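Researcher: Please generate the 3D structure of the following complex. Treat every line as part of one assembly.
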Amino acid sequence: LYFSRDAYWEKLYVDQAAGTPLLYVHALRDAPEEVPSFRLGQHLYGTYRTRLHENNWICIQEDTGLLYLNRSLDHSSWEKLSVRNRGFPLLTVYLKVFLSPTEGECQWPGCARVYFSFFNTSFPACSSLKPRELCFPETRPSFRIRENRPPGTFHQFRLLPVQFLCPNISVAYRLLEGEGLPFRCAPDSLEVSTRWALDREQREKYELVAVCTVHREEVVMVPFPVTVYDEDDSAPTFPAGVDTASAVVEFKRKEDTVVATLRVFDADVVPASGELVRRYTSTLLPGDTWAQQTFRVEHWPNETSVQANGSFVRATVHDYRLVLNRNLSISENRTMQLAVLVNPVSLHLPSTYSLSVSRRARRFAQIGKVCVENCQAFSGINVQYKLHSSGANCSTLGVVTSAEDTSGILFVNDTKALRRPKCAELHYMVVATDQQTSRQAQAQLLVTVE
Amino acid sequence: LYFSRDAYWEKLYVDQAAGTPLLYVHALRDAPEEVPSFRLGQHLYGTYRTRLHENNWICIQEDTGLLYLNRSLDHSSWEKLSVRNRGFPLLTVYLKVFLSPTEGECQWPGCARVYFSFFNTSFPACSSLKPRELCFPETRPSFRIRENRPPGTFHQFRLLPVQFLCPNISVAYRLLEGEGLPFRCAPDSLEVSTRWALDREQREKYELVAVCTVHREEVVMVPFPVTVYDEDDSAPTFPAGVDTASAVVEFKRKEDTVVATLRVFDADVVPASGELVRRYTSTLLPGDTWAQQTFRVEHWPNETSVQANGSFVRATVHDYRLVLNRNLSISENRTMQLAVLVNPVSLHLPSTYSLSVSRRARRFAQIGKVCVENCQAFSGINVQYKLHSSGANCSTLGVVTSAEDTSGILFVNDTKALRRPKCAELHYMVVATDQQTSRQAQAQLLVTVE
Amino acid sequence: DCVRANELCAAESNCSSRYRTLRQCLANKECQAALEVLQESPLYDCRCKRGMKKELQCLQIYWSIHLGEFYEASPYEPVTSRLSDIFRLASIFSGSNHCLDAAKACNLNDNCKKLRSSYISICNREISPTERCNRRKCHKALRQFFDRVPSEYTYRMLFCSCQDQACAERRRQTILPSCSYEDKEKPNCLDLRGVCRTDHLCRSRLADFHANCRASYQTVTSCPADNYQACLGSYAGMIGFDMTPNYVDSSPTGIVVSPWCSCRGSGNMEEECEKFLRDFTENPCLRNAIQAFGNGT
Amino acid sequence: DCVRANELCAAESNCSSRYRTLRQCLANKECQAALEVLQESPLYDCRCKRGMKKELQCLQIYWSIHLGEFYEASPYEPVTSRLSDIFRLASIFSGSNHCLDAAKACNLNDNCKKLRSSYISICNREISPTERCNRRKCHKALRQFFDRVPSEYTYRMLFCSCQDQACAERRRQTILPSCSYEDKEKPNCLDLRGVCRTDHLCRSRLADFHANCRASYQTVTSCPADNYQACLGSYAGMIGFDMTPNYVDSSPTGIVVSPWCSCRGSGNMEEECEKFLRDFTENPCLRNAIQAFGNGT
Amino acid sequence: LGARPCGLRELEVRVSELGLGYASDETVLFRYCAGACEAAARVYDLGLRRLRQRRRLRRERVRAQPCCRPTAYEDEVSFLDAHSRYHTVHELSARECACV
Amino acid sequence: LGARPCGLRELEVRVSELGLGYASDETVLFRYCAGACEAAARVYDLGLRRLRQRRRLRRERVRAQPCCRPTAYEDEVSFLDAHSRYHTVHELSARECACV
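Model: Done. Output below.
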């Protein structure tokens, strides 16, 4: 069982007649054998859930959910409720309504808080009332309906204080643009009910038009929105299939490595974030080799992305079964598979750059670059190309440093402009290491200055 | 008895013959019955009274005062004396010579320090000596003679090491420009003596000319100065008489009040500062009234000035007997007398100063001065003239303050230039107090501004 | 204030023992009693104010005696200032790119200009080639801006009117959306509110927001006592926290504001997500209050 | 030094007990023994130096072990510098109103100029209508001036030669006699010695003067070992004490110096007073030294 | 004289009007140091004047009188320019004024 | 440019030559602050220059560039004048130099 909504309301006034039926609170079934046993909380609450006074005014019919003032709510009672309202103006009070004995948190579907408003005056003259306040609740109604639940009556349009205090005013209701939907309200009826069990294949929300006539005749209509919830029986999934193909290059480290993303969607836990966040599952084993050391599965964004932040290991191929279920090992599962196929140019090519004596440098003398095909091999994590020499007596030292940038560049300071003519042919050698291995063993560069 | 001087000298040399008479030490009498009993100290002293060695070389004839080397003073003895000279070059040594047995501080008249000089060589050849070193002491002689003392022999001119080591060289002495003086030296004599008792009526110092001839003949002369001391028998005093006249004005306070100065001079304790400083006397009583509370006697500068730094008292006349003696109540006294005759205008005259509206003041508006004959009455210590007012509604306040200067001046700030026309006749009142009494009772000043 | 209101009774054995009891939460029985005993304390039903000295402690102390919801209480709200809020509307009534004139008015005010520049220079600070600013420090920067800068510059600039999109964007750019408001992602407003709820200042000023900005129907302008500024003040208080609202676009007059979030992934809670988010965009109070204020009402 | 020389044995029971014994002065028997025992201590025959740290204690400690007069000991004298003082003459030999050129040399030297101003600005300071200066503070400033300024500025200015009275007056005015030297009265030189004798620094530097500036007859120039510098140092050290010598007049070349005192009222000590003055005025050492130094010796 | 003393001045100027290349229509209170120096020319300045006028000193970029210059600037000013971006400028508006 | 940098220069000048009324033939080391200012014009000065050139600022004793002025002087210098009297002079020789 669950209430048609989590909060109700109606207008209360000073010194209303004892017994005044106020409203109905409704609850629909999950199984046809379910029958509610309505009850109330023992205290009336005010602004921000202020506990004001023992509920000696409002009572409920345990079968129909009818709320009424079992005792006349006079001015003094309002003032007593007012002074206990923690300094706030006493405009709305409420009480808790439950489906069964418990006492417990008023948490819908198992409860609703009936928020009664109040005016520091007696009931207004019926002749002064408009069809809006005669027909439909003060604020706009909002309904809550679940899927794969038996149909039944969920609301009565007619306001009970109007029938009770204004029985001379005739009001009747119906639905417009409701054809083909489970919602029905017979012509000139006071009640509204469903006809068939709701499911997700019908709608994810309803908004109908509710209309009434009063008396002289006046017609008024309001929106009739209904919140649809998601069936919780199974995980309809997935429109996407499985594709285990992938590839990894050895010594191609990234700060955030990705093997594959298989985007997923289901009708069960994707509609709401909480449905998956509260409970979710992913690949359990194998773990030790890859899943424990490097790679993880991102199932919570409905991506099924396998990615890694740590270092790589030897080319060990695998194919892991990914779990996409909500609850693993106690419910029907949905899984997919992804494989990793792990397979570094290490070019040794001495670029013979040409220099000039008395170079017209601004600050430094550029020699050249060390950018090679490895730039994509290690994916921007440079292997630290270092150019050195001990044979030539010219350009002894400069800024030929192991630049960390993807490309890498080498140059010397504009300090040997008059030393380069000492010798024409300068011999350099370049090496580079990374990932605890020798990447570029050696290349001997012939660089001239004349 | 007292020595003819407080320090002697003679030239010593390496390896001089034992027994070499060095010099005479002389002492004159205070009474004819006095005969000296000369003796020496047991150690030879060096630079800055360094105790060098037991006096085993120099001895003295107790009757004649003749100093001689009882043992030959060789090189090794000099070196022994040298190393004990506290690092100083050993150029002069001395010994103490006394008049009687005591042992005691070598303090002349009761002692003399015989400062023998020394050369690191043997005695020079007599033929190389000049009449200066053959006749007269190395340094210039200085004699010390006292007054009212019997005459007698006080020095022998002839140098004993010259007679001892150079007896072949004939030397004889006399005085020039000594006629009429107590000093005599017979023609071609070796000795010099006085003939009459010295007194202050003769001289306060002597400087004669001592001359000798050697052999070929050479004549040389040196100054013959003699220090004269003052007779100590009584105080010949004073050429100044006594004048008790003085005057003091009541309420004429000074920071340094003077009654009178009677300048004094005597032949006893004025010649030397120590004679009076060591012992002196002044007025003893009456004390309580004036001498204890305010005034003192300045006798030590030979002024006899009576002066005061403290506050004055009522006009109590007195005449105190001042003591000018060296030693009071045990010797003949010399006294004088000074009296004090203690006798404040307090003018009450409202000076009617004229002001102007819209005064072209630089910073302030000058009214006038409070200067008065009282300025000399209190001798520059102003009685704090204060000008005030409460009746006029103009020039409410300014800088009309009780100026401390002798004259005193009153003014206001240039802040009421456009308020003075409010009223023409401004009424002020001036009062002044000092010395715990009302000096200027009141005067009402009429000051106009229009 | 709430800090002193605690001290007035904190020395008492009653408040001392029962304060600790609620900190624990049988215990539930004693914690319920602790509420009833502390209910009479000066702290209980105390009030704080925006910009209060120790504005954090005045709420941590008060909240610590909450017994343990969609709309929270507003003990932080300076209730007595509600009158002053009306007066501020009278002021702006007396005192073309109107947002520029508002900015120029600040630039000429030594205090506002200094504070304004002193915090923009934080929010416009580049951190890295792919990080526009330190948004947290910016939020702290703005958080102080809206309490230390006088209302007659803070609100004049924040709720300035416009005639064109150049002004309207200037209005949107008031607090550097590229730093304080915009980001790579728009989290779910319901989760974002849940995060805000855990922070005393954000949660309480959020309570202040719907305390004066709830889309009410009983009043004419959907504002308490039709008070435009009461909403506008509580609204501005939210700038500098996780729930920082901002203008949606640069419409010359179509003023719409919301935090930096959406309702994707709400499912069963889509209503509650919108129920709160609608208070920013479908709220006649903010709509009329911002326009009326900016127009000199 | 003298301070440490005492500490080296002061820890010993011998020096400790006998040190105190001499402070007491039968006692004379034990005090005489104390002299003989302490005679072997490192303090005995110690020396101090110009500009030594604790220039006072290095003398008070030394003199305290004397058992208890024209020529007193010079333990303050930097004896070891005597050799250097001879060599300093060679330096001085290397380096028209001559005193002006000396002054200009100082004016161009930042250190000399500042120290020079630092004492003139004090010595020329008026105190009251009938008090030309604070002579004590002047002496203090002069005392430091002539120890901190390099010798080639102190001696070049203080002992410059002249050709006329305009220069010669400049020479005499080097230390502002109207403040540091001249006064209303000329006290008795001997009484001043009695006063100076009580101060360890004054008395010792006075002894230093009569150690190196005594009008000696054995040498050619009346200076120790004919050393012009020996007197120049000890003489200059006298500036800033009761016996501060200065030039008598402004003779273009007839250089005569003396302290600010006379021999009136000496009586029995008339000659001894003169004998102290002769070392200033009748001393070929100062005469030949100052003239020679003025000529670049 | 009628000249005003050396001190702080102000003028409201748009950022773009300042000619700094920043295309912004915001105004700032542009303060600056200006006016007659009350302090007399320093003894240094008097010597500089006399030695300069008489051509005793090397011809050089000198100043023979105190300059009424600022001693401090305001911390900063920020603005929103025509490109929907913010910028801060330092050392633009005088905070302290004195003759040096 | 050939302009030398802002810094301290010196010239030995007699006291009386300074024109201060002090009749003395002693010399002093007259130091002074002069030369090109290395510091670039601030955005303050750049705005001032643009506002000055366009006559947006009140005509006033202003400076459109840093002044190469001293920041400190020697304590004092003493001398003996023609009348056998001493005198000290303050602020006659620059001790520190900087552009303001």
